[PDB]
């Protein structure tokens, strides 16, 4: 069974990488660009960007270990450990030339260690809508004068005693609807069918658990990045962020300036946290233009 | 049918206040002390202190509206609205003399507006283990370098879409056990018997919902406290706080110095958030001493 519809002209395939069976969707010709999804989604969040990049590139969009149709990692869930899997997978399809990287949400957490360790392997970099794990996330507020913050799930998911799985299992459709819509500026792009598909994928028990292990590894990722961040990023990089309810706002480019020297940023008005879905037309253009220069 | 065992020499009774049937446990002779419990608990959290205070005082411990055996409020759940019920309840037993007030957790939120507005009625004040609702609560972090913070529940409880009720229904004991133990330094005082008593009580649907309405009203309470705090507290006051994992630490006294003229503070080493249960002997000593001078 496929969990999501493949864009016509693309292939759904699997590939073993350090003993872990990873799922990906591949298509196109030319240099390799990897699109890495985040939490509450799968490779499918790139389905509108994929057919356009495929006219100029070979496009691969994997499912993070344990999510979508990929097996869980065998090492661990910290960024360094997961970045190992994504790097080798990408190197399997572009072993001789550098590749491009687009990452979103916790897709950033699971690639930054690979980028900083193999700068030569990464030609261009696009990061959208996520902090890189570092001490700054320890300052996001738990509660606001506007009501619930959008980052309290950090602690909820990270909690011991399997608190989040115990409360959410059997209620994924309800919880995921609230989680996605509260971080979105444009909620109506999340149709009843798309939420059902994502909820079905995340209700696989190993996937609900894998989801939260990423957050349970977050403190490790922060400790990892404190050393890794001693090397700044050399390649051209672009940040994208939503400027509406739920978007990263100015924070995305500001933090990136501490990691990268050659960075340009865009804040998309009226867009929240799920840019590929909420603002596909403006977002794709910026990605296609940046990756084609 | 009583939800908790009444101590020898005390009576469980009811009293209508502004149309609301309030539950309370009363005992002793002499001047009145009112003990006001907090979230996840009932009057019963005071059951060790009550027979000791009753040697010198008339002791009353009510259930907050909507929690324990008290009916929900008819007006609202903001501090100013709840304070009306607690003030009028107490004055029905001490209409001619001022009375003393000991409050814990959201017991502070629901008494500070009464204290500030009727200062002649409050002889002495003991506050323990809770911030007064004001702009500082907007600075507590969502996530820490130590892992799950102890305040992410502010947003969880205040969330729209009935998020907390839906996620916790059918898992009340499980949630309450994690909530209490993660805020405690001394977990062994929370027996399975005690946790069931509290779990059953707040699992009543109107009590589970009332619990979250306090947090849902917090932003209103902050705006209310912004006006009230222009009048500083003139009565003698004492703050108690735990110095171990889960306690308020030095924050308790520091915030109170902005509200009160005459305040002395204590931080109890090795104690978390639940002082009456975790550190009864030291906490009772300080309270009985303070109210007796």
């Amino acid at each position, epitope marked *: 069974a496929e969990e999501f519809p493949v864009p016509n002209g693309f292939e759904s395939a699997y590939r073993e990488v350090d003993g872990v069976k990873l799922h990906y969707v591949k298509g196109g010709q030319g240099p390799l660009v990897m699109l890495v999804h985040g939490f509450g989604q799968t490779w499918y969040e790139w389905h509108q960007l994929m057919p356009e990049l495929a006219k100029r590139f070979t496009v691969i969009a994997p499912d993070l270990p344990g999510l979508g149709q990929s097996e869980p990692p065998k090492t661990g869930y910290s960024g360094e450990q997961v970045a190992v899997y994504l790097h080798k997978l990408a190197r399997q399809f572009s072993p001789d030339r550098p590749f491009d990287l687009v990452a979103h949400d916790i897709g950033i957490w699971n690639t930054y260690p690979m980028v900083v360790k193999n700068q030569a392997d990464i030609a261009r970099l696009v990061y959208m*809508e996520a*902090p890189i794990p570092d001490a700054r996330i320890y300052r*996001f*507020p738990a509660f*606001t*004068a*506007q*009501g619930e*913050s*959008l*980052v309290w799930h950090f602690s909820f998911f990270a909690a011991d005693d399997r608190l989040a799985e115990t409360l959410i299992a059997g209620k994924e459709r309800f919880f995921l609807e609230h989680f996605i819509k509260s*971080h979105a*500026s*444009n*909620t109506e792009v999340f149709s009843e069918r798309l939420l059902d598909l994502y909820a079905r994928s995340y209700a696989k028990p190993h996937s609900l658990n894998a989801s939260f292990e990423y957050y349970r590894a977050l403190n490790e990722s922060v400790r990892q990045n404190a050393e890794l961040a001693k090397t700044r990023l050399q390649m051209p990089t672009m940040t994208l962020a*939503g*400027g*509406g*309810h*739920g*978007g*990263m*706002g*100015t*924070f995305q480019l500001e933090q990136m300036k501490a990691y990268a020297e050659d960075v340009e940023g865009h804040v998309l*008005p*009226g*867009c*929240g*946290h799920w840019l590929p879905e909420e603002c596909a037309a403006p977002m794709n253009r910026l990605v296609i233009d940046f990756l084609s220069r | 049918a009583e939800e908790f065992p009444v101590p020898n020499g005390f009576e469980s009774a009811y009293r209508e206040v502004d149309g609301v049937k309030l539950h309370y446990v009363k005992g002793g002779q002499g001047p009145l002390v009112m003990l006001v419990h907090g979230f996840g608990q009932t009057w019963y959290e005071w059951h060790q202190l009550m027979p000791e205070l009753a040697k010198r005082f008339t002791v009353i411990a009510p259930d907050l509206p909507g929690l324990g055996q008290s009916e929900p409020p008819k007006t609202g759940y903001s501090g100013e609205q709840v304070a009306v019920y607690l003030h009028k309840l107490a004055r029905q037993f001490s209409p001619d003399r001022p009375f003393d007030l000991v409050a814990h957790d959201i017991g502070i939120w629901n008494t500070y507006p009464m204290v500030v507005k009727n200062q002649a009625d409050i002889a002495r004040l003991v506050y323990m283990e809770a911030p007064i609702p004001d702009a500082r609560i907007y600075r507590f972090p*969502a996530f820490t370098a130590q892992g799950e913070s102890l305040v992410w529940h502010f947003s969880f409880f205040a969330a*729209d879409d009935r998020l907390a009720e839906t996620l916790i229904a059918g898992k009340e004991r499980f949630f309450l056990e994690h909530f209490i133990k993660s805020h405690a330094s001394n977990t062994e005082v929370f027996s399975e018997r005690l946790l069931d008593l509290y779990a059953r009580s707040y699992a009543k649907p109107h009590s589970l919902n009332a619990s979250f309405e306090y947090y849902r009203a917090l932003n*209103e309470s902050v705006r209310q406290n912004a006006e009230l705090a222009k009048t500083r507290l003139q009565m003698p006051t004492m703050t108690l706080a735990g110095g171990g994992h889960g306690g308020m630490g030095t924050f308790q006294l520091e915030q109170m110095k902005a509200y009160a003229e005459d305040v002395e503070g204590h931080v109890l080493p090795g104690c978390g958030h639940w002082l009456p249960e975790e550190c009864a002997a030291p906490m009772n000593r300080l309270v009985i001493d303070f109210l007796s001078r």
Partner: nanobody, 110 residues
Framework: VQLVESGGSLRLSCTTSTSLFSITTMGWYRQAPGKQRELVASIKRGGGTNYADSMKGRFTISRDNARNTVFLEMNNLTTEDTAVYYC??????????????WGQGTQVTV
């Protein structure tokens, strides 16, 4: 993000250059020439409304998502209510930063 107020019993309106749904909270505030700025009414993106005391009964806040427009309906006005009335759009970012945008304000004289 840009707010355009208009108007100034009476009904006030404010339009946003972005979707009203991309705005966490919409609020009306008023200010007398020498007094503190005070809240009139709020409406969150999900529909919850908040009114300041002694504002209920005379005011009604509402929106029109097709028009990207928020309305302030003022009834049984009194000299005690004349001010410059401002609409505020507050945007809650993922990080918890709140950025505020204000309309050019419109004068109400009674």
């Amino acid at each position: 993000v840009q707010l355009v107020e208009s108007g100034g019993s009476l009904r006030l309106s404010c339009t946003t250059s972005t979707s009203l749904f991309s705005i966490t909270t919409m609020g009306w505030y008023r200010q007398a020439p020498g007094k503190q700025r005070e809240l009139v009414a709020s409406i969150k993106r999900g529909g919850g409304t908040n009114y300041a005391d002694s504002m209920k009964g005379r005011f009604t806040i509402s929106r029109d998502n097709a028009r990207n427009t928020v309305f302030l309906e003022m009834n049984n006005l009194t000299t005690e209510d004349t001010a410059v009335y401002y609409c505020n759009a507050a945007i809650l970012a993922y990080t918890g930063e709140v950025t505020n945008y204000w309309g050019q304000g419109t004068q109400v004289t009674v």
